[PDB]
Design a protein around this ligand. Structure first.
Ligand SMILES: CCCCSC[C@H]1CN(Cc2c[nH]c3c(N)ncnc23)C[C@@H]1O
Ligand SMILES: CCCCSC[C@H]1CN(Cc2c[nH]c3c(N)ncnc23)C[C@@H]1O
Lengths: 232, 232
């Protein structure tokens, strides 16, 4: 098994990258892919850069150049569900765009024509993630993650998301793009992120303070998940 | 010279596709790329599907698999500039995301971190496009094109764009994604689209009525532009 891992920011990939043995770097299309072994398992770790198009470009290169068997999206997220605190884990069962709108032609809010309204994460990957959460005694919520190209910071931006996706557990800027690419290539995916902020008026301050905390929790989860998948 | 051409919808690529001699089809990642000769010039024409991620995925495959020398983005657009009528041509000097917002961290509205605030189209390609416009006696405007994942249909969606980008001449859903991918691969690009609607409350009705008109005008421009570039 080769496990593909995608993170947007330096801070979200640095802990995993440092653990990769025999590390090689592919530099293509403005992104970096690091290949080698993570606790004995072959991995390909993409640092994509921020937002939907960066993520889409990077994921496409990762799939084409490395042919990973599955994709895990790691990093931070803005928490939306009431029981989430900084550091807590969010696991996708599904990803949707919160900023896509072709409802004038009768598509569901968030749905682009030619796509399902949402992209479902892989059941086996979800189950493995939940097993790791249990083993590591972490607080986690499984559910809908929504993506757009905006850093959510209270005001009207948060309000629109709570209005249109009251079931969304977290918001970020890459997951659904990754999900979409994986859908089109028929590659299983899961998102395993951790909370850096609660997407309110203070979220920029919380993000600066707690990105590192969130990166560490997600990275430790991903390390555990890689091991669990490779062993099983 | 090999010219890369990208269109999102069937209607936007069908006229060019039908003119391709010795046509072959590559089907990968949910998109189609058609290769062959257009009036003697080698071309690779991508049908990407709609929106930013579809466009990004498709453009990445096009660049990787076909290595075109330049990229031309064809199709329809929502007109924003006052002198534009249905069928008229818009030529990018630049592309920006109208839905990207990381201003909480001091980036320019529409700018994603790690990107320029806008992506500049190639001066030589712009000049060739303007020469074709003159030769074909078309009404055109050159300027900023903005992209997002929403079909603009008056109300608050149009209002936000007029507020944040009063200089934008047109709006659509793929151009900036294509521009971003081309930027990251250092490939020159130009957008040459035609107006299907003016992005107001009636734009869905106008789009249904005039997509074919807009596709034809853009396609005829692109055919002329391919010839002009290959000859010069
Ligand atoms: C210049 C500093 C970076 C600003 S953009 C935020 C990063 C972290 N990612 C997740 C993320 C955490 N909190 C969020 C929020 N409140 N809104 C939207 N995304 C998030 C998305 C993107 O890769
Ligand atoms: C289900 C029918 C298709 C609906 S989505 C519209 C198509 C046509 N493209 C350009 C386009 C023309 N007018 C526009 C407008 N008012 N807003 C935003 N984009 C546009 C973008 C996208 O590929």
């Amino acid at each position: 098994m080769k496990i593909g891992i995608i993170g947007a920011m330096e801070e979200e990939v640095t802990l995993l990258r440092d653990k990769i043995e025999n590390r090689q770097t592919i530099s293509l299309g403005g992104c970096e892919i690091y290949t080698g072994q993570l606790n004995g398992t072959e991995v390909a770790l993409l640092k994509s850069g921020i937002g939907k198009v960066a993520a889409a470009l990077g994921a496409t290169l990762l799939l084409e150049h490395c042919k990973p068997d599955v994709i895990i999206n790691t990093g931070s997220a803005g928490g939306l569900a009431p029981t989430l605190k900084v550091g807590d884990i969010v696991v996708s069962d599904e990803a949707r765009y919160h900023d896509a709108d072709v409802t004038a032609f009768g598509y569901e809010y968030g749905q682009l024509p030619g796509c399902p309204a949402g992209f479902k994460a892989d059941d086996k990957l979800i189950a493995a993630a939940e097993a790791c959460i249990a083993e590591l005694n972490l607080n986690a919520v499984r559910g809908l993650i929504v993506s757009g190209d905006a850093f959510i910071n209270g005001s009207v931006g948060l309000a629109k998301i709570r209005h249109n996706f009251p079931q969304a557990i977290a918001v970020e800027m890459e997951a659904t793009a990754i999900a979409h690419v994986c859908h089109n290539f028929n590659v299983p995916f899961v998102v395993v992120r951790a909370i850096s902020d609660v997407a309110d008026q203070q979220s920029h301050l919380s993000f600066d303070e707690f990105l590192a905390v969130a990166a560490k929790q997600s990275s430790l989860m991903v390390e555990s998940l890689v091991q669990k998948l490779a062993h099983g």
